[PDB]
Amino acid sequence: KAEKILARFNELPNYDLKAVCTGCFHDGFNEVDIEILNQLGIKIFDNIKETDKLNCIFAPKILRTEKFLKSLSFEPLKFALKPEFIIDLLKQIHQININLFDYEINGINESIISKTKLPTKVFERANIRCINLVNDIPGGVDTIGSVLKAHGIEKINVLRSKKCTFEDIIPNDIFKYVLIVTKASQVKKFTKLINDRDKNETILIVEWNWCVESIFHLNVDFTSKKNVLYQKK
């Protein structure tokens, strides 16, 4: 049936895309529409699975979605495209000359895309391996945890803010203690616990936005003060 529409073409490009969409196409296009896409070497997935070796993200612009943040840990990310690509392409199909260069997402340049080829993840490069995360983090620990792990964090210890003691805090096995927190009340509690029990050791306490901006640049800038609530080094 899609063959019929595609019969009239002398030859079909193979775009070799393995993608997810975020901020666009939030389930699909019709069955023929997707059938055409597969015939053109474009496969669109529902969720991100590490062993699908995704290489593409469609999105209208840089977004703070779980999917977008996770696309920055594809191995590698090859294409970050506007949905206008799938749209102009399907429009043409209903020779094929839609190209993979006229649909770049603003702000996602080559320098950034190419960091996804590095043999390390952004936080691994930064020696942030184990962190503590407050349970009242917006987005929830499960999701935020999943983004952080995709980006090189090996252990996520969730801390019940109000009730937690020093023993609950895990070290980062360089900052000995790394915590991601929501409010100032939390900074004071944690700095007090650690300084009482492990006075001479180093501590980094940041906001969620510190991680987001690290991911968007695929680099932890330790000289930056923005989103850093407390540091003892």
Binding site: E66, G139, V212
Partner: peptide, 5 residues
């Protein structure tokens, strides 16, 4: 819809 963080 997708949660923006």
């Amino acid at each position: 819809a997708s949660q923006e963080l």
